């Protein structure tokens, strides 16, 4: 549709990009949100562990990495909070999902349950658990 505020470009519409983005955990519609959130949190915590231990205030002392690891965990907690409130102000208890109903081709498909109170709650819980697990794994691998 030429009258929609979007353009078709090789980057935005390519088989490789489409496949890679559709295989990301944030776009798997059929899977329940908990398993996606667990993976997202694991990856985010494992990434976040590094910079705190590499550029922290105590980075030159012997405690450094341990302290940095703790800081990373704290950040995850804050992020989890930033998720929870976002659910409370967005999705009500009884309203259905607000995800798009039809695909690009035009076929009718089941809307994602991530945009729901229970779905978002599961996503946040999985994200918190995965973030804590990833931070712990990164610390153990780096300093053992």
């Amino acid at each position: 549709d030429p009258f929609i505020g979007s353009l078709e470009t090789p980057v935005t519409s390519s088989p490789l990009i489409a496949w890679y983005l559709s295989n990301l955990p944030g776009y798997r519609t059929a899977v329940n949100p908990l398993l996606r959130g667990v993976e997202v949190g694991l990856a985010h915590g494992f990434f976040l562990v590094g910079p705190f231990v590499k550029a922290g205030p105590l980075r030159n002392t012997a405690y450094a990495g341990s302290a940095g690891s703790l800081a990373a965990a704290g950040l995850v907690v804050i992020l989890s909070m930033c998720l929870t409130i976002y659910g409370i102000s967005s999705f009500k208890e009884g309203e259905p999902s607000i995800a798009p109903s039809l695909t690009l081709t035009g076929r009718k498909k089941q809307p994602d349950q991530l945009q729901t109170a229970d779905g978002w709650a599961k996503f946040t819980g999985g994200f918190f658990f995965g973030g804590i697990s990833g931070v712990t794994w990164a610390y153990f691998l780096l300093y053992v």
Partner: peptide, 30 residues
Amino acid sequence: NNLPSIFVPLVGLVFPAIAMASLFLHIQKN
């Protein structure tokens, strides 16, 4: 003693977060 080491982090960090969360939730409520 050591009261400042317990009270400064509380007022500086925890209370602003609690107040911000409460105010955001109250504002966004319909």
